[PDB]
Scaffold this active site. Structure first.
Site, mmCIF file in Angstrom:
data_model
loop_
_atom_site.group_PDB
_atom_site.id
_atom_site.type_symbol
_atom_site.label_atom_id
_atom_site.label_comp_id
_atom_site.label_asym_id
_atom_site.label_seq_id
_atom_site.Cartn_x
_atom_site.Cartn_y
_atom_site.Cartn_z
ATOM 1 N NE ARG A 119 40.868 48.602 36.409
ATOM 2 C CZ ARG A 119 40.705 49.079 37.642
ATOM 3 N NH1 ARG A 119 41.353 50.162 38.050
ATOM 4 N NH2 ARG A 119 39.868 48.466 38.469
ATOM 5 C CE1 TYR A 120 42.295 48.460 29.139
ATOM 6 C CE2 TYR A 120 40.737 48.887 27.359
ATOM 7 C CZ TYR A 120 41.601 48.027 28.033
ATOM 8 O OH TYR A 120 41.769 46.717 27.603
ATOM 9 C CG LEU A 160 44.958 44.140 30.192
ATOM 10 C CD1 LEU A 160 45.550 45.555 30.166
ATOM 11 C CD2 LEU A 160 43.672 44.103 31.002
ATOM 12 C CB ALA A 161 42.236 38.710 30.036
ATOM 13 N N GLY A 162 42.180 39.618 33.168
ATOM 14 C CA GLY A 162 42.405 39.182 34.536
ATOM 15 C C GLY A 162 41.436 39.848 35.481
ATOM 16 C CB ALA A 222 44.542 41.243 37.620
ATOM 17 N N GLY A 223 42.875 44.327 36.881
ATOM 18 C CA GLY A 223 42.911 45.388 35.877
ATOM 19 C C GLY A 223 43.887 46.501 36.192
ATOM 20 C CG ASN A 279 35.260 44.815 27.455
ATOM 21 O OD1 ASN A 279 34.939 44.848 28.662
ATOM 22 N ND2 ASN A 279 36.246 44.056 26.990
HETATM 23 C C1 LIG Z 1 43.077 44.799 24.687
HETATM 24 C C2 LIG Z 1 41.890 43.938 24.979
HETATM 25 O O1 LIG Z 1 41.979 42.723 25.069
HETATM 26 S S1 LIG Z 1 40.403 44.674 25.197
HETATM 27 C C3 LIG Z 1 39.375 43.544 26.071
HETATM 28 C C4 LIG Z 1 39.765 43.547 27.545
HETATM 29 N N1 LIG Z 1 39.751 42.203 28.085
HETATM 30 C C5 LIG Z 1 38.639 41.550 28.433
HETATM 31 O O2 LIG Z 1 37.511 41.956 28.197
HETATM 32 C C6 LIG Z 1 38.850 40.235 29.153
HETATM 33 C C7 LIG Z 1 37.811 40.021 30.251
HETATM 34 N N2 LIG Z 1 37.775 41.099 31.227
HETATM 35 C C8 LIG Z 1 38.687 41.235 32.202
HETATM 36 O O3 LIG Z 1 39.664 40.516 32.311
HETATM 37 C C9 LIG Z 1 38.473 42.348 33.194
HETATM 38 O O4 LIG Z 1 37.074 42.670 33.246
HETATM 39 C C10 LIG Z 1 39.276 43.608 32.838
HETATM 40 C C11 LIG Z 1 40.774 43.327 32.804
HETATM 41 C C12 LIG Z 1 38.866 44.180 31.481
HETATM 42 C C13 LIG Z 1 39.005 44.663 33.907
HETATM 43 O O5 LIG Z 1 39.508 44.241 35.181
HETATM 44 P P1 LIG Z 1 39.118 45.040 36.507
HETATM 45 O O6 LIG Z 1 39.193 46.512 36.202
HETATM 46 O O7 LIG Z 1 39.909 44.482 37.656
HETATM 47 O O8 LIG Z 1 37.542 44.714 36.627
HETATM 48 P P2 LIG Z 1 36.903 43.392 37.286
HETATM 49 O O9 LIG Z 1 37.328 42.185 36.501
HETATM 50 O O10 LIG Z 1 37.131 43.442 38.779
HETATM 51 O O11 LIG Z 1 35.357 43.648 36.943
HETATM 52 C C14 LIG Z 1 34.501 44.345 37.846
HETATM 53 C C15 LIG Z 1 33.053 44.042 37.477
HETATM 54 O O12 LIG Z 1 32.880 44.142 36.055
HETATM 55 C C16 LIG Z 1 32.102 43.052 35.549
HETATM 56 N N3 LIG Z 1 32.728 42.485 34.322
HETATM 57 C C17 LIG Z 1 34.047 42.315 34.102
HETATM 58 N N4 LIG Z 1 34.279 41.782 32.873
HETATM 59 C C18 LIG Z 1 33.084 41.600 32.281
HETATM 60 C C19 LIG Z 1 32.596 41.072 30.979
HETATM 61 N N5 LIG Z 1 33.461 40.622 30.037
HETATM 62 N N6 LIG Z 1 31.256 41.056 30.764
HETATM 63 C C20 LIG Z 1 30.376 41.500 31.686
HETATM 64 N N7 LIG Z 1 30.750 41.990 32.884
HETATM 65 C C21 LIG Z 1 32.063 42.066 33.239
HETATM 66 C C22 LIG Z 1 32.022 41.999 36.644
HETATM 67 O O13 LIG Z 1 30.662 41.604 36.873
HETATM 68 C C23 LIG Z 1 32.652 42.626 37.882
HETATM 69 O O14 LIG Z 1 31.781 42.554 39.025
HETATM 70 P P3 LIG Z 1 30.637 43.619 39.460
HETATM 71 O O15 LIG Z 1 29.984 44.118 38.188
HETATM 72 O O16 LIG Z 1 29.711 42.780 40.313
HETATM 73 O O17 LIG Z 1 31.410 44.671 40.229
#
Ligand SMILES: CC(=O)SCCNC(=O)CCNC(=O)[C@H](O)C(C)(C)COP(=O)(O)OP(=O)(O)OC[C@H]1O[C@@H](n2cnc3c(N)ncnc32)[C@H](O)[C@@H]1OP(=O)(O)O
Ligand SMILES: CC(=O)SCCNC(=O)CCNC(=O)[C@H](O)C(C)(C)COP(=O)(O)OP(=O)(O)OC[C@H]1O[C@@H](n2cnc3c(N)ncnc32)[C@H](O)[C@@H]1OP(=O)(O)O
Lengths: 222, 222
Positions: free
Chosen positions: A205-206, A166-168, A171-172, A199
Site C-alpha cells: 500500500r505504501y 494506520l489501519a482499515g 481503506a488503505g 507486513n
Molecule cells: C504505521 C503502521 O501502523 S504500520 C502497520 C499497518 N497497519 C496494519 O498492519 C493494520 C492491519 N492492516 C490493514 O489495516 C490493511 O491491511 C492496510 C491498511 C495495511 C492496507 O489496506 P489496503 O491497502 O486497503 O489492503 P487490504 O486491507 O484491502 O488488504 C488486501 C489483502 O491483503 C491481505 N492482508 C491485509 N492485511 C493483512 C495482515 N495483517 N496479515 C495478512 N494478510 C493481510 C488480505 O488477505 C487482503 O485480501 P487478499 O489477500 O485476499 O487480496
C-alpha cells in the site's frame, strides 16, 4: 562493540518491566556480558546493512525480534478523503480497534506479556486523539457510522510528518490520501511511515501510494 | 514443531560441507536437537511474518543471517539500453566483479569459509554467461569497452523472468531497462527480483522502476 546501556524509563513504567536499550557509539564503554547481565530485557536497533553489528550482538546473546522498513512519500495536494478528526468520545472504539490490530508488534510474546502489545498501541491511539504523542487521529466512517479506518499523524520538523498508526481493511488508499492531505495542509514535503518487514499488505500500500524505502533495521533483544 | 530436513546437495559438493535445509510443515517428523545433530550447518528460510517459526527455530539455536525482500514489476514500455550478451571472454572480468560486489552475502564468514561467498557469486555469474537463451548475463559497456554494469536473467515460467545478480555503480536505471527488454523479448509479463533487506540502494532503484513488494523472508542458520 562499544555502547551505552540506558533504562527505557517510559516502557518500564508502562509494561512493568526492567528494560534497557543499547546505543552503539565510539565513545561508550565496551559492551560486555557483565554489563548486560542484570537487565530483565535489553533492546538494540541496528541498520540491516550492518552485518558486523548483527554478528557482534548475536555474540552477546541478542536474538532477532523483527525487521523494520522506514519509507518516505512525497507530499502534494492530493485533496481530502472526507476523513474527520477523532474526538475524545472516539477513544474507547479506537483503543479497541488498535489493541486487536497491533497485538503482534515488537512487544509480542514471548518477549513481553501476551496483552502488552495491545495495551501499548491502545495507549498510542488514545494519545494521538488527545494530542500528547501523535498530534491527531483521523477517522473514516462507514454508512452505519462505525469506524472503518483510522490514521494517526504528527509533525516531525519543518519539512516532515509521520504516520504513527494506520489501519482499515479496504481503506488503505483513502487513509494514505488522508495522511498526505494532512501533511500538505501543514506545509510538509515529506511523509514518513515505518512498518514491520513481514507486513507485506502495508508495504504494498505504501509503495502504491508513492513511497520509497529510506532505511531498514533489525530490532534484537536479550 | 515439525519439519523436513534435506541435504543441500549442490552446496555440499561446492563448498565441501555437510549442510541441510529445514522446512517447517505439518507432514514431517518432529524438529528436534537430535534431528539437527548430523549436520555441519543447517539453514532455514522463513516468511518474515511468521514469528512462530522464528521463535521455534531460535529455541533450537538458529541465528539470523539476513533478510530478503522479493519484488516484482510489470513488463510494459520497453527499450534498448545497448547492452550486449556476455561471452566466454568476459567470464574472468565478471567473476572478479561479482566476487567483490556480493561479498556480504549469506555465505559470509563466520558461517562459511572466508573464500566461500566470492566462489559462490563468481560461479553464479559464470553459469549465467554459459547459459542459453533461457539464462543469460547481459553487459552494459562504457565507451572504453569496459564493463559498466551487468545483470543476470532467467526465464521462470510462461509469464515471468527473474533478475539474479545486478550490479553497476551509476547504472541502475540502464540495468533495469536491460532486464525489462530481455523479459519483453520472451513475451514475459512480469519481472521478479530479490535483494537483501539491508540493500537500500537496490530497493530504491527497484521501487523507482515500478516494482512492489511480493514477499519478505529471513535466512537463519545453525
Ligand atoms: C504505521 C503502521 O501502523 S504500520 C502497520 C499497518 N497497519 C496494519 O498492519 C493494520 C492491519 N492492516 C490493514 O489495516 C490493511 O491491511 C492496510 C491498511 C495495511 C492496507 O489496506 P489496503 O491497502 O486497503 O489492503 P487490504 O486491507 O484491502 O488488504 C488486501 C489483502 O491483503 C491481505 N492482508 C491485509 N492485511 C493483512 C495482515 N495483517 N496479515 C495478512 N494478510 C493481510 C488480505 O488477505 C487482503 O485480501 P487478499 O489477500 O485476499 O487480496
Ligand atoms: C538482484 C541483485 O543483485 S540485488 C543487489 C544489487 N546489486 C548490488 O548491490 C551491487 C552494488 N550496487 C550497485 O551496483 C548499484 O549501486 C545498484 C544497482 C544497487 C543501484 O544503482 P543506482 O540506482 O544507479 O544507484 P548508484 O549506483 O547511483 O548508488 C547510489 C548510492 O548508493 C550507494 N550504494 C550503492 N550500492 C551500495 C551497497 N551495496 N552498499 C552500500 N551503499 C551502496 C552508492 O555509494 C551511492 O551513494 P552516493 O549517492 O552517496 O554516491
Amino acid at each position: 562493540v562499544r555502547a551505552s546501556i540506558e533504562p527505557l524509563t517510559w516502557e518500564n513504567a508502562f509494561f512493568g518491566v526492567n528494560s534497557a536499550i543499547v546505543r552503539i557509539t565510539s565513545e561508550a564503554p565496551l559492551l560486555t556480558p557483565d554489563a548486560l547481565a542484570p537487565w530483565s530485557r535489553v533492546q538494540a536497533k541496528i541498520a540491516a546493512s550492518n552485518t558486523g553489528e548483527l554478528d557482534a550482538l548475536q555474540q552477546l546473546g541478542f536474538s532477532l525480534v523483527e525487521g523494520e522498513v522506514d519509507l518516505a512519500l512525497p507530499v502534494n495536494n492530493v485533496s481530502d478523503s472526507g476523513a474527520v478528526v477523532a474526538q475524545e468520545t472516539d477513544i474507547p472504539a479506537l483503543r479497541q480497534l488498535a489493541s486487536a490490530a497491533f497485538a503482534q508488534s515488537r512487544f509480542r510474546a514471548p518477549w513481553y506479556a501476551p496483552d502488552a502489545s495491545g495495551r501499548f498501541y491502545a495507549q498510542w491511539i488514545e494519545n494521538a486523539v488527545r494530542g500528547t504523542f501523535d498530534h491527531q487521529c483521523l477517522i473514516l466512517r462507514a454508512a452505519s457510522g462505525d469506524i472503518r479506518g483510522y490514521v494517526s499523524l504528527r509533525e516531525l520538523n519543518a519539512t516532515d510528518a509521520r504516520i504513527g498508526l494506520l489501519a482499515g481493511r479496504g481503506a488503505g488508499a483513502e487513509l494514505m490520501q488522508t495522511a498526505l492531505n494532512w501533511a500538505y495542509a501543514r506545509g510538509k514535503t515529506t511523509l514518513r511511515v515505518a512498518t514491520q518487514m513481514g507486513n507485506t499488505a502495508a508495504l504494498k500500500r505504501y509503495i502504491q501510494s508513492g513511497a520509497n524505502v529510506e532505511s531498514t533495521a533489525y530490532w534484537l533483544y536479550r
